[PDB]
Write a protein that binds this ligand. Structure first.
Ligand SMILES: [Cl-]
Ligand SMILES: [Cl-]
Ligand SMILES: [K+]
Ligand SMILES: [K+]
Ligand SMILES: [K+]
Ligand code: NA
Ligand code: NA
Lengths: 93, 94, 93, 94
């Protein structure tokens, strides 16, 4: 599935981009910048809110582009990896 | 190719976010960027660290979510197709 | 569409139930209890967190039952009401 | 009727939430009810007012979301069908 591979790579690149942005512009530790990016694009949300106007505008754009990529990856992960794995693990052998 | 469905979803989304920006900046007294941010993280379900302080703002937010959530995720989906397709196609027929 | 009518009534009943619960057990004003119920079941989330163990257990159960009802209603609202309305409003007359 | 798909999704969900309850109560030092609550509002995307305080807890949460979000919404959907069907059917063939 080349669609799954592309969504995987773009999701990785997206989370790297957010990690770099929030550590640089919002001053977060990289691990906190990564956490922020993940919980934002999965729509879980965080206690942390961007403090700068640049962070706020970026996050708006990051949200609209990133949700579609991340949930596209999550759907393909479920269908192509997790579902076949569960089915295989339910087979009596 | 021209994607009218995408173009209309884009227009509807932007109009919906402008309406929220106007409401929260005037009724809840937020800066425009904060009113837009609240509008976005509400309709995408990310969620705000801020809560409306007025009953009017709370009632508007409830209605805003039901009027807008479907439109916004419709737009996110069509945006995803348009943004991701060049990468997918470049990895198919280079 | 009787499926839409049922989901509508159940969503109303669900939000009334949450309004009554959070005002009684968590001491919220009714409007704040309603707000909490709505943003919780739409997964938006709130700054308010249940303080009592009863509120926490109820909210867990309310979330699992309520998300499915509310997003079922939202999907039918989009398909049966909002989409036809938008299409009708795009017709040149 | 027996809905094995629902039964398995239920089992997977409960096991996933137990794993999160154990992790957050031991690594992040939460009461079990708070660890379960965090686990639930994370995987349903409602979101927590609490953030993990340890790097280990932050890394686990990232992986937890990707391992669990799909399963949990699969379960929410099947639960919705089973919970709503009696009301729908009672309003069809009373
Ligand atoms: Cl501004
Ligand atoms: Cl406990
Ligand atoms: K959410
Ligand atoms: K959220
Ligand atoms: K939140
Ligand atoms: Na918060
Ligand atoms: Na908060």
């Amino acid at each position: 599935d080349k669609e799954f591979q592309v969504l995987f790579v773009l999701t990785i690149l997206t989370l790297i981009s957010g990690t770099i942005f929030y550590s640089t512009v919002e001053g977060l530790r990289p691990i906190d910048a990564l956490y922020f990016s993940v919980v934002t694009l999965t729509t879980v949300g965080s206690e942390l809110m961007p403090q700068t106007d640049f962070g706020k505008i970026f996050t708006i754009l990051y949200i609209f582009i990133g949700i579609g990529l991340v949930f596209g990856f999550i759907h393909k992960l479920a269908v192509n990896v997790q579902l076949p794995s569960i089915l295989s693990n339910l087979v009596p052998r």
